[PDB]
Design a protein around this nucleic acid. Structure first.
Ligand SMILES: [Mg+2]
Ligand SMILES: [Mg+2]
Ligand SMILES: [Mg+2]
Ligand SMILES: [Mg+2]
Ligand SMILES: [Mg+2]
Ligand SMILES: [Mg+2]
Ligand SMILES: [Mg+2]
Ligand SMILES: [Mg+2]
Ligand SMILES: [Mg+2]
Ligand SMILES: [Mg+2]
Ligand SMILES: [Mg+2]
Ligand SMILES: [Mg+2]
Ligand SMILES: [Mg+2]
Ligand SMILES: [Mg+2]
Ligand SMILES: [Mg+2]
Ligand SMILES: [Mg+2]
Ligand SMILES: [Mg+2]
Ligand SMILES: [Mg+2]
Ligand SMILES: [Mg+2]
Ligand SMILES: [Mg+2]
Ligand SMILES: [Mg+2]
Ligand SMILES: [Mg+2]
Ligand SMILES: [Mg+2]
Ligand SMILES: [Mg+2]
Ligand SMILES: [Mg+2]
Ligand SMILES: [Mg+2]
Ligand SMILES: [Mg+2]
Ligand SMILES: [Mg+2]
Ligand SMILES: [Mg+2]
Ligand SMILES: [Mg+2]
Ligand SMILES: [Mg+2]
Ligand SMILES: [Zn+2]
Lengths: 224, 156, 211
RNA sequence: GUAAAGCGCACGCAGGCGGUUUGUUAAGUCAGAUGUGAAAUCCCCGGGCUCAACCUGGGAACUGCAUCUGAUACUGGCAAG
RNA sequence: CGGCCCCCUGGACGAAGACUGACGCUCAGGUGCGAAAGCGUGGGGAGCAAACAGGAUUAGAUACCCUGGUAGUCCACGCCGUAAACGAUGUCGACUUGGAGGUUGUGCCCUUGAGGCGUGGCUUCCGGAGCUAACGCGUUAAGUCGACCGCCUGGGGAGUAC
């Protein structure tokens, strides 16, 4: 992504000067209208160097977890993961999603069992109310683990939108040593992101830019 | 090939509305006998469940120490809360001169000749944390040589 | 809180009867007394053969006893002899031509009666109760039981204050009538009194009624 | 700080401590040497009682003290800043 | 330490210079100051109020409640020298991420009041590393160090006896 490509999307935009985090000073161009302005001169090379690492991970058969819980951007992140055959979390993050992996596996198995059971049959044997209740539980399990049913094991890389909002995820990752790739607004604490991208995390246009560029490079890394 | 060792078993209590509920806590250590050592602490309603819980926890967070032919590299101090352990290298055949909680940790960690001593509290949990912290801060001639930008011969 | 007998509450839902004959009101009590005596004699003479169940049918003018056991050879005896020896005395007790069939329990650690009587036999040979409890529960869970609860009660270890200790592993839903739960009891007569053992074993819910 | 334990607060003599630069001094300190530090005991290598305890040869040690000759980074003295 | 005014007087701080040239820090013993109650002498005395006098309440009230009410509280000059005299945290110096206030100086700039950008003193509250048994402390440390002083060594006996 080129600085012009970002700037038109509005990547330079930031939170209010009232709400910023201390470590973000190096990445901040300045202030206008009491608004923090992010410096694309740092943003572009860091994003490119992160894309290099993401391409490397995906080119060694890496499993990638796209992470974002914004109600606006949930579907964008889900489609972003689907466009590169990867795994995602678009619904509210569950604590212990990575650290408590065994419990997630039981939930994954239950979701698989319900969908397999409906295809196999015996829903006729169940009472009509019971069969409908089982379908409702299957829908709830899908709304909870649609993205990670096929992750199989712990992912090899994480992509995070608004790292401050998803702070539990990054704490878990660091506890596991799983690398964190994150779009970091001025209000976030950048310590947890090993490849940090400072940029707007709310705006739909810039978020979609991040996701599309990452997914293009991930498909490229897969293709070899 | 990871030798394990139970250090202590305590009987803790907690009074729910009706009466007391007794639980068992197990403090254990595991190690490969060649410079990798970890400790674990487990709680359960019954003793063997607590012990096995501690065993799995001990396998996790197994730190690596820089040993020197079965003894330390230099005298080292390890302080956790009240407990304050002093460890010091010794010659071959000295044995493990240490207190119980230190003896288990040192024996599973892979040292055979140390002279240790525990000052302050001798609570097994804190003593174990103290001695593991002391072993972790131990430096090696090659490590300090790379750190200071000299060669191992320029230091010894 | 008292609990309904989990076997009796599922009769005709997922569990069958142990007696499956028909009788009017004038030969009903006679039939109950007859097959009570039959079951009593068979449990007395076969206490070492690990007998799990005694089903009793009464065709037109006969009686057919099916013995669900875990050690068929011991029940039959060599050359197929002891089975006939007990068949003739069953015919004497019932006062009608008798037949004896023998069905083998291929996995004894999944039958509630066998687990319970094993636990009681270990108890009256002064084995520590928690050991036998844990071993039974783990053996059952290992062979594919989806849940088991074992409860031993009454003056354990020869104390002076009787207490009840139970241990559950897995899923044992007692309020689900659709669930197939095998339940049995047994009593050990130790030198300090009688000790009661109860075993629940859950083997998965059954869909489609008795069929 | 709350477990025993900060004087109720200040001023202040004796006392302890003292920024920075050069010169000098050589008291502390340091190095070497000489004298002395009884023998026994302790310790090391040996020898003698059949072994051991025990006895015993030589050494090491006796961490000290005084003196002489040096060293001058540091502390002290003195002088000038 | 609390109305206002005058007279005499102590300290702190800031701006810009000039001057002195280590003249410093701490401090056993010593000296002074030191709430309230209390003491001695004299004065004063509205309110308040130990003691006390009643009225009640209460098994009991020598308490709490009520009506009175002396010393005392006030002033002058002496004495006393003790408080949960507390931040339960000795004094001095250096160093170590932040954020939000109060208060009091001050520099510079803008059309100037207004406002902006600084820079000191004191002070209040969150909190990072670190520390701590924990609670918590956290640039006004209970953090990292240095100088000197005071003090502690199980509870009771006892801050008592001599
Ligand atoms: Mg102690
Ligand atoms: Mg009932
Ligand atoms: Mg105290
Ligand atoms: Mg004080
Ligand atoms: Mg002073
Ligand atoms: Mg002086
Ligand atoms: Mg000096
Ligand atoms: Mg001096
Ligand atoms: Mg000398
Ligand atoms: Mg001598
Ligand atoms: Mg000899
Ligand atoms: Mg000799
Ligand atoms: Mg000599
Ligand atoms: Mg000098
Ligand atoms: Mg001058
Ligand atoms: Mg004094
Ligand atoms: Mg007074
Ligand atoms: Mg008086
Ligand atoms: Mg007076
Ligand atoms: Mg008077
Ligand atoms: Mg009055
Ligand atoms: Mg006092
Ligand atoms: Mg006060
Ligand atoms: Mg005090
Ligand atoms: Mg200070
Ligand atoms: Mg003040
Ligand atoms: Mg604080
Ligand atoms: Mg300090
Ligand atoms: Mg402290
Ligand atoms: Mg005492
Ligand atoms: Mg006194
Ligand atoms: Zn944001």
């Amino acid at each position: 992504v080129s600085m012009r490509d970002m700037l038109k999307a509005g990547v330079h935009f930031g939170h209010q000067t009232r709400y910023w985090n201390p470590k973000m000073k190096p990445f901040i161009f300045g202030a206008r209208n009491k608004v923090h302005i992010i410096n694309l001169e740092k943003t572009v090379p860091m994003f490119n160097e992160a894309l290099a690492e993401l391409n490397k991970i995906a080119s060694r058969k890496g499993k990638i977890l796209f992470v974002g819980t914004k109600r606006a951007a949930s579907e964008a992140v889900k489609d972003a993961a689907l466009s590169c055959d990867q795994f995602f979390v678009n619904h509210r993050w569950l604590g212990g999603m990575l650290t408590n992996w065994k419990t997630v596996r039981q939930s994954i198995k239950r979701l698989k069992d319900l969908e397999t059971q409906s295809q196999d049959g015996t829903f006729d044997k169940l009472t009509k109310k019971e069969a409908l209740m089982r379908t409702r539980e299957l829908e709830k399990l899908e709304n909870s683990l649609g993205g990670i049913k096929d992750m199989g094991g712990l992912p090899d890389a994480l992509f995070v939108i608004d790292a401050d909002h998803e702070h539990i995820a990054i704490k878990e990752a660091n506890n596991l040593g799983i690398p964190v790739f994150a779009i970091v607004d001025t209000n976030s604490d950048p310590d947890g992101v090993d490849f940090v991208i400072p940029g707007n995390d709310d705006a739909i246009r810039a978020v979609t830019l991040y996701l599309g560029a990452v997914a293009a490079t991930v498909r490229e890394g897969r293709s070899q | 090939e990871l030798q394990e060792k139970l250090i202590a078993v305590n009987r803790v209590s907690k009074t729910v509305k009706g009466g007391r509920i007794f639980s068992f806590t197990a403090l254990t250590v595991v190690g490969d006998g060649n410079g990798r050592v970890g400790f674990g602490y487990g709680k359960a309603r019954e003793v063997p469940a607590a012990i096995q819980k501690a065993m799995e926890k001990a396998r996790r967070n197994m730190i690596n120490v820089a040993l020197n032919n079965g003894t330390l590299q230099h005298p080292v101090k390890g302080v956790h809360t009240g407990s304050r352990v002093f460890m010091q290298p010794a010659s071959e055949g000295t044995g493990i001169i240490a207190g119980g909680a230190m003896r288990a940790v040192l024996e599973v960690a892979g040292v055979h000749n140390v002279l240790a001593k525990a000052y302050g509290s001798t609570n097994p949990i804190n003593v174990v944390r103290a001695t593991i912290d002391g072993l972790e801060n131990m430096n090696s001639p090659e490590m300090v040589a790379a750190k200071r930008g000299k060669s191992v011969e320029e230091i010894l | 809180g008292q609990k309904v007998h989990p076997n009796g509450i599922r009769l005709g839902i997922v569990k069958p009867w142990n007696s499956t004959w028909f009788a009017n009101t004038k030969e009903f009590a006679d039939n109950l007394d007859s097959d009570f005596k039959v079951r009593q004699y068979l449990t007395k003479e076969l206490a070492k053969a690990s007998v799990s169940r005694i089903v009793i049918e009464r065709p037109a003018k006969s009686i057919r006893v099916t013995i669900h056991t875990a050690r068929p050879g011991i029940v039959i005896g060599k050359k197929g002899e002891d089975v006939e020896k007990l068949r003739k005395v069953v015919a004497d007790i019932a006062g009608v031509p008798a037949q004896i069939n023998i069905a083998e329990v291929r996995k004894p650690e999944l039958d509630a009666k066998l687990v319970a009587d094993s636990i009681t036999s270990q108890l009256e040979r002064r084995v520590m109760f928690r050991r036998a409890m844990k071993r039974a529960v783990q053996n059952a869970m290992r062979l594919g039981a989806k849940g088991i609860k074992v409860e031993v009660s009454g003056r354990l270890g020869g104390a002076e204050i009787a207490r009840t200790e139970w241990y559950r592993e897995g899923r044992v839903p007692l309020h689900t009538l659709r669930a197939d739960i095998d339940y049995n009891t047994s009593e050990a007569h130790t030198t300090y009194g009688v000790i009661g053992v109860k075993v629940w074993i859950f083997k998965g819910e059954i869909l489609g009624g008795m069929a």
